Amino acid sequence: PFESSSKSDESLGSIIIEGTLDKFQLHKYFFIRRLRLLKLEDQTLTAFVGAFQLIKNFIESISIEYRKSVRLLEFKHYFITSMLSYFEFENVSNPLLCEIKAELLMLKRDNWVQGVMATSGYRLMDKNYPNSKETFVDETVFQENFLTLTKEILSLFNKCEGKRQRIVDILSIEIGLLYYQGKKYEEAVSLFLSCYEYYTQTNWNSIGLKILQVFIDSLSHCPKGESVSASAVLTNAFLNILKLCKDNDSKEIWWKKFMDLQMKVHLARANVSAIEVNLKSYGFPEDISTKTMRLSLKNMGGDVIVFGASDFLLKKGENKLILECRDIMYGEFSLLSFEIIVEGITFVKEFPENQDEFIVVPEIY
Amino acid sequence: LRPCFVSLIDESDKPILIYVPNEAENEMNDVLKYNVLSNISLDYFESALVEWHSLDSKPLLKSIFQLEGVSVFAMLIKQTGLKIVIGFEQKSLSGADDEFEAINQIFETVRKIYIRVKCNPLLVSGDEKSIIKSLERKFDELFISTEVEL
């Protein structure tokens, strides 16, 4: 003799529709806690998301008037006692770290409480708060200490679930303020700053355009596949692709060669600024093949050293070039002075082998 | 009544435009928070057993979230793989249901604006540059610039 969850949801809606009382939604909180203890061992977590929506409506009830610790402190205190989401069910072999997601949201609420209420300890470098008393952070250095301990314990514990790759792919990629709050040389924290910064370059840009802004200060005034001299140049000289403004703020266009101005070893590059397009290859003087090439221009400087290539069906011919082209404008007549002919352009010479362009760091295409 | 950003992502998980109103003429650098909120919602597509979708007839306004000063959600139509999201600033938030269906219907207005500008053949091969400026130029009057209409 029982009734299902539809009567529970309809009775919750009818108890919400009952009005004119003057409580702090205790009539809602009674049925919310009864539905919470009815919604624990289901291994479902959707009614835990409904409990999170109940916590959101309770947060809006506290947030109807909460400002400047006159009642913002009351709203943060009500949320810190409303951390019974973490203090009701907490078990291993549960339904995949929904408590870790809820504790992450509650840690964001507590960081907003410590980051808000005037004070100081700016441990976010973004000031989430906006215009307008547990005492966990009694100092600004202790504000960084008590929160980086919080944001590292709650980082990979949410990765214990099924593979979402959601928070620690971003927030543990947000360890820029973990050591470069004030301390300059982040060689200790070089696991994500200047190691795998391309995961937002391969994703959508302008996130990594500030991540690489602090992935150069670990090598701007600091010395000593973690062995390099200037081989961190994909983040230094090949950061001009994400640098949309080059004619303004040309310190991203000066330091590409100023890092190499006292260089010395090679690498690869995309040549995604200067495009290259072919043309009608003609004939020339004695043993001069002389293909025709057109090259674009988006980088600043000149005086390259380059050659073209064209593989046959057996061996490469490497139909060379003058290697002093000095590309300043688009679609210019590159000379492509080519010798050592592989059988008079034998018609299986399909132009597949790349047209590199080296300025001590090679740029294959 | 005013969104705090407008974000557009297609089916390849490539963000089309993370548009923020009023980054010039007003406060900068919170756009650096705005696009990483968009990326948090992008890898927060479905996580920790929370399901937004149960009605397959029309894709309605799905599950609200709230995170570090904003209130975001998602509206996956599932038609041509469009994954567009809108946040709101929690400061000026009344939290009613006509508000909830109001932001549902203005989500369908920005859906209408995208599907109008998607098939304007007055300029053809508008897919990389000034299609974005044109759609921003159609964004920035539907929620703001009402100040002089009267």
Query: CATH number of the domain that B89 lies in?
Result: 3.30.450.70
| Closest residue on chain A to B53 (Cα) | A46
First to last CA, chain B: 18
Q: How far apart are CA A365 and CA A356, in angstroms?
A: 6
Q: Which long-range contacts (CB under 8 A, 24 or more apart) does A205-210 make?
A: A205/A242, A206/A242, A206/B18, A206/B31, A206/B32, A206/B35, A207/B32, A207/B35, A207/B36, A207/B39, A208/A242, A209/A242, A209/A243, A210/B32
Residue B21 lies in a domain: yes
Give the distance, in angstroms, between the CA of residue A218 and the centroid of all CA atoms in the same chain.
Answer: 18
> Whose structure tokens read 């980054």?
B23
Chain A residue numbers with beta carbons less than 8 Å from the beta carbon of B32 are 126, 206-207, 210
Comparing CB atoms, the residue among B35, B43, B67 nearest residue A166 is B43
Give the distance, in angstroms, between the CA of residue A78 and the centroid of all CA atoms in the same chain.
Answer: 34
CB contact under 8 Å between A207 and B36, yes or no, is yes
Distances (CA, A) of A11 to A6, A31, A38, A276: 8, 9, 14, 69
Strand partners, A294: A277, A333
CB contact under 8 Å between B32 and A169, yes or no, is no
- Name the amino acid, one letter, at A286: E
Distances (CA, A) of B149 to A256, A261, A270, B136, B144: 51, 59, 51, 20, 11
Please enumerate in sequence order all residues whose Cβ is within 8 A of that of B53, keeping only pairs 6 or more positions apart, or say none: B59, B62, B76
A301's tokens: 């400087």
Please check whether residue A338 is in contact with residue A291, taking contact to mean a CB–CB distance below 8 angstroms: yes
Residue B53 lies in a domain: yes
| Closest residue on chain A to B68 (Cα) | A128
CB contact under 8 Å between A101 and B47, yes or no, is yes
| Closest residue on chain B to A47 (Cα) | B50
Please enumerate in sequence order all residues whose Cβ is within 8 A of that of A41, keeping only pairs 6 or more positions apart, or say none: none
Please check whether residue A169 is in contact with residue B43, taking contact to mean a CB–CB distance below 8 angstroms: yes
Residue B150 lies in a domain: no
Residue A149: which of A95, A202, A107, A212 has the closest Cα?
Answer: A107
**Method of structure determination:** cryo-EM
Instruction: Give which of B13, B64, B66, B99 to mutate to test A binding, by max A Cβ within 10 Å.
Output: B66
Q: Provide the number of structural domains found in chain B.
A: 1
Pairing of strands B83-85, B6-9: antiparallel
Residue B129 lies in a domain: yes
Residue B112 lies in a domain: yes
Comparing CB atoms, the residue among A57, A166, A200 nearest residue B44 is A166
Smallest Cα distance from B64 to chain A, Å: 8
CB contact under 8 Å between B95 and A98, yes or no, is no
Residue B149 lies in a domain: no
Comparing CB atoms, the residue among A97, A101, A207 nearest residue B35 is A207
Distances (CA, A) of B124 to A120, B28, B84, B113: 53, 33, 23, 17
Q: Which domain holds residue B9?
A: 5-142
> Whose structure tokens read 């968009």?
B38
Q: How far apart are CA A218 and CA A179, in angstroms?
A: 11
| Closest residue on chain B to A52 (Cα) | B65
Residue B147 lies in a domain: no
Comparing CB atoms, the residue among A49, A60, A165 nearest residue B43 is A165
Pairing of strands B83-85, B75-76: antiparallel
Residue B88 lies in a domain: yes
A53 lies within 8 A of chain B by CB: yes
Chain B residue numbers with beta carbons less than 8 Å from the beta carbon of A166 are 40, 43-44, 47
